What does this fold into?
Amino acid sequence: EIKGYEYQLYVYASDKLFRADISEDYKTRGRKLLRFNGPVPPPGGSGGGEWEIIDIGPFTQNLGKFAVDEENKIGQYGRLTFNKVIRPCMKKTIYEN
Amino acid sequence: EIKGYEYQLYVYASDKLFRADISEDYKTRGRKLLRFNGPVPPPGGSGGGEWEIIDIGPFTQNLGKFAVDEENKIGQYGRLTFNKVIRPCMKKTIYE
Ligand SMILES: [Mg+2]
It folds into this structure.
């Protein structure tokens, strides 16, 4: 049976974007702020669309390897070694309108 | 009808966690790194569970208000005024 939930929210406050991580008890509906960090970059890039959770199989792992390979051309964090992609992996599909 | 895709990935590299935002064009299949940011905290808390996208209706807006009200007790960023929660909003279900 459900023990509770964790939520990850992108919340604007004072015109700035933050990531908030919240825990919630199923039985009491009592809530806890786990983390509040930012400002964070907005999700996505261009175009409207709907977000979905996808699995983290080989295709998603190779997207992570792509991202690290590209970042290593930039070098902002030094030379990085890809380890793995973790859940959740989110995908937005953008339809031409 | 499909223009392309965007991905938001949590990727460990050199044992540090980063958020990577990637675009993919449907017609060319080309991929672009939009943003790479971190180190970031891992999503969720301890314990496993399954993630889903939820809507940003009143329940979700009130979670955002909860968060801003709580953060305003500490004040690491000063005093904040809640504006809104945007998409995507993610929910992880934890089972007993
Ligand atoms: Mg959907």
Observations:
- Chain B has one helix and five strands.
- Chain B touches chain A through 69 residues (CB under 8 Å).
- The domain at 48-96 of chain B is CATH 3.10.450.10 (Nuclear Transport Factor 2; Chain: A,).
